[PDB]
């Protein structure tokens, strides 16, 4: 029942001993005796993996979380914890970064998060593009590492949706000379941009396109979680789709999220059978979780009736359980909001979405 | 040494004059008394009358010493009150304000070597009681090309009736969390009116233009309840 | 969001790294705001010095960068300031706080926190608090003849203030110059009634927030 935690931040372990010491035994009913622990992140990267792998596995812990935005790897994700624990069965919660290649089950055995990847934001965008026939739309992702995979669930989305797109496909990871696309899209069906790269490779397209004078109307532009923070927000056009999603953007709170599913995947498996501590993690020990795809099957297979988000229908890929979003609008950076995504269907709240093009009705898209 | 002159001629909210009476000044216009209670009751009675030597130093006249000792009247200023006291309370009963008896009265600690100072009630009007208000203006001066041109600009609001207490830089412009664009600039103060100016260096560039929708501000005062803020968009040069 | 204590130091050296306490307290630092310290001196208009991202990339300009080495402390959400060399200019009201970008109006204070660049010198020396009484034989007016006489002490960045100050009923900001002696006589007074002189005395609570020096009387 021995439960480990890797966070770097003094604030994240404050966060961690709060919400294992009090509100712990709420999720469900069972009197619950886990052992909470944290081990703090070395600046070196082969350093923090041999402390994970000589006290995690070493002192049968069944579940973990990686919050901490300055990881040692200088690559925000986490890659030596979940490299080393991978081979137990592990599920190493990896909330702290948003790759869609490191969300998906074929190179990373156990990895999950409460953080919706590319995949997830992409299958938003998808879902909020049937809603006013978006069929005809163009992808201006320049990223190649995810936005590869991005690019594939989208056209996977639009054959699956009985048509196809017309550009789908990368030019340059931040380029300069993409005027040429521009003005053939002047030309084309819809203006809805499709942008899921970094900072810097979505700033150089910002800029691109308002030295071209790109801001006209019919322009719905799809960001993500980090792709508007800091400088950006002034090279994208006033009125860009900022997706938010509950418990995402505070630590504290997604940390508190991601212990809520930890005791709630916990209580689960309490309510089953077969329960069986992982192997330790001793020197010539090269040992198997038994229990590792009935975990998987548990944690992603499954529903949660309670916890944190108090949702249902979890994914099947544990990558954010559909819920209710938190889009707030970027209009000359004001607190206006449009359109939010209800996990099932975009319910339109009280204020209406405005465009940048000028009015706020359906614009010339 | 432990007392100097001060930035404005008002003690104000935070001076460093700890003789003075009211924060602001006294509420005499003519023909009342104004008592300039400038007690101490410091190590200064070394066996005899307490030396205190007020003066004034309004502009144009230089500072004369009115009464020596508060004992004894000195040659040289009319006797147009009534100055006595001996230990720690000094009677200064200033009854006739008139137009020469209208300047900060610098309580001099006379058994200090050092020339110090005190007092700074000025004997003017105050229009921060229920009765007196001051309100001042409510329209916003455009910065100019140049200022938006060089990155640092400044937009200058026009506030001509208000006091250096009285300066609301509490501002509200949906939700906004930032610290610090403006400061407490004051001028020189009329005895008609009190007539001061506000000014402000806010820094405000062509992309920070860009990207700034409104500019509603508070200029809500005690006596400006209703301020018409203008909520100007860009453009405005 | 108003948690955001700016804490500053009064007893560094002059001429030497300023380590200014940035208290963070509040929403998580995500590259968010412009989290910069505005210096504010009279003479002078503020230069836009950067911001800082989610782990820290010291995005401030490049002429105040190699001087002026900003820190990033995320373990503790509070980092610190390498400001060397302190000149006249650069010893002002700092703002250090987060910053929408934009410039849309700030919500804080407007008065700042003073880092005076001093020492165990003559500036500051022990409170010589002094027997005030209150005259009920005088009338100044409609005011009264309150106050403290509180001398020799931390000068005007000291945090002296009313009685228990709940209500600040005549706490307000008045531009002030600071003394060539270093011994300042800031004596804080609310306006009090006339009938409240002589009745009730008021002496301002004189507290050091640098020396810790809680004596006033």
């Known amino acids: 029942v021995n439960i480990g935690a890797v966070l770097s931040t003094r604030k994240h372990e404050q966060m961690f001993r709060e919400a294992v010491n009090q509100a712990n035994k709420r999720h469900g009913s069972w009197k619950i005796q886990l052992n909470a622990t944290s081990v703090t992140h070395k600046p070196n990267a082969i350093q923090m993996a041999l402390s994970v792998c000589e006290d995690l596995i070493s002192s049968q812990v069944y579940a973990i979380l990686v919050s901490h935005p300055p990881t040692p790897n200088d690559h925000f994700t986490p890659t030596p914890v979940s490299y080393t624990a991978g081979f137990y069965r592990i599920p190493v919660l990896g909330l702290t970064t948003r790759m869609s290649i490191y969300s998906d089950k074929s190179i990373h055995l156990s990895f999950l998060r409460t953080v919706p990847p590319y995949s997830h934001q992409s299958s938003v965008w998808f879902e909020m593009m049937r809603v006013y026939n978006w069929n005809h739309i163009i992808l201006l992702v320049s990223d190649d590492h995810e936005g590869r995979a991005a690019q594939k669930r989208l056209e996977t989305l639009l054959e699956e949706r009985e048509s196809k797109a017309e550009k789908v496909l990368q030019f340059d990871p931040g380029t300069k000379n993409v005027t040429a696309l521009l003005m053939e899209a002047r030309e084309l069906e819809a203006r809805v941009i499709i942008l899921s790269a970094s900072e810097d490779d979505a700033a150089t397209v910002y800029r691109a396109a308002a030295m071209l004078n790109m801001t006209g109307s019919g322009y719905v532009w799809l960001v993500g979680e980090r792709e508007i923070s800091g400088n950006a927000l002034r090279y994208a056009p006033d009125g860009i789709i900022g997706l938010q999603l509950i418990n995402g953007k505070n630590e504290s709170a997604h940390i508190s999220d991601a212990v809520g599913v930890v005791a709630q995947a916990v209580h689960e498996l309490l309510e089953k059978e077969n329960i069986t501590d992982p192997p330790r993690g001793c020197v010539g020990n090269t040992n198997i979780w038994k229990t590792g795809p009935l975990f998987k099957r548990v944690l992603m297979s499954s529903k949660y009736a309670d916890g944190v988000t108090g949702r249902v229908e979890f994914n099947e890929d544990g990558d954010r359980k559909f819920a209710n979003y938190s889009i707030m609008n970027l209009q000359n950076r004001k607190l206006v909001q449009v359109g939010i995504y209800n996990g099932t269907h975009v319910i339109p709240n009280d204020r209406k979405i405005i465009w940048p093009g000028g009015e706020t009705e359906k614009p010339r898209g | 040494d432990i007392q100097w002159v001060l930035l404005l001629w008002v003690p104000g909210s935070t001076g460093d004059i700890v003789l003075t009476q009211s924060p602001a000044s006294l509420a005499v216009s003519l023909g009342q008394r104004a008592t300039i209670s400038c007690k101490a009751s410091q190590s200064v009675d070394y066996d005899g009358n307490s030396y205190m030597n007020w003066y004034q130093q309004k502009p144009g006249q230089p500072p004369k010493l009115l009464i020596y000792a508060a004992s004894n009247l000195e040659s040289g200023i009319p006797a147009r009150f009534s100055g006595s006291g001996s230990g720690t309370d000094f009677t200064l009963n200033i009854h006739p304000v008139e137009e020469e008896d209208a300047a900060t009265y610098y309580c001099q600690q006379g058994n200090e070597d050092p020339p110090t100072f005190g007092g700074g009630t000025k004997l003017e009007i105050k229009r921060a009681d229920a009765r007196t208000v001051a309100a001042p203006s409510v329209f916003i001066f455009p910065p100019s090309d140049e200022q938006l041109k060089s990155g640092t600009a400044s937009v200058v609001c026009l506030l001509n009736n208000f006091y250096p207490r009285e300066a609301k830089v509490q501002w509200k412009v949906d939700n906004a969390l930032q610290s610090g664009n403006s400061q407490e600039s004051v001028t020189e103060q009329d005895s008609k009116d009190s007539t001061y100016s506000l000014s402000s260096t806010l820094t405000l560039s062509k992309a920070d233009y860009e990207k700034h929708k409104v500019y509603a501000c508070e200029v809500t005062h005690q006596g400006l309840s209703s301020p018409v803020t203008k909520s100007f968009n860009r453009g405005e040069c | 969001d108003v948690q955001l204590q700016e804490s500053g130091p009064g007893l560094v050296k002059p001429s030497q790294s300023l380590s200014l306490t940035c208290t963070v307290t509040?929403?998580?630092?995500?590259?968010?705001?412009?989290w910069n310290w505005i210096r504010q001196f009279p003479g002078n208009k503020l230069e836009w010095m950067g911001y800082?991202?989610?782990?820290?990339?010291?995005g401030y300009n490049p002429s105040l960068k190699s001087r002026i080495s900003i820190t990033r402390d995320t373990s503790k959400n509070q980092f610190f300031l390498q400001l060397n060399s302190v000149t006249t200019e650069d010893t002002a009201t700092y703002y250090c706080a987060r910053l929408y970008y934009g410039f849309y109006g700030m919500d804080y204070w407007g008065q700042g926190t003073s880092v005076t660049v001093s020492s165990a010198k003559t500036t500051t020396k022990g409170p010589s608090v002094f027997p005030l009484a209150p005259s009920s034989k005088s009338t100044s007016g409609g005011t009264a003849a309150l106050g403290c006489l509180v001398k020799d002490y931390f000068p005007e960045p000291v945090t002296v203030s009313w009685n228990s100050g709940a209500l600040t009923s005549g706490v307000h900001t008045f531009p002030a110059v600071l003394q060539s002696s270093g011994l300042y006589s800031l004596s804080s007074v609310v306006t009090v009634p006339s009938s409240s002189l002589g009745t009730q005395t008021y002496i301002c609570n004189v507290n050091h927030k640098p020396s810790n020096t809680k004596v006033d009387k």
């Open positions: 800082i991202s989610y782990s820290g990339s010291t």
């Open positions: 509040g929403y998580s630092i995500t590259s968010d705001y412009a």
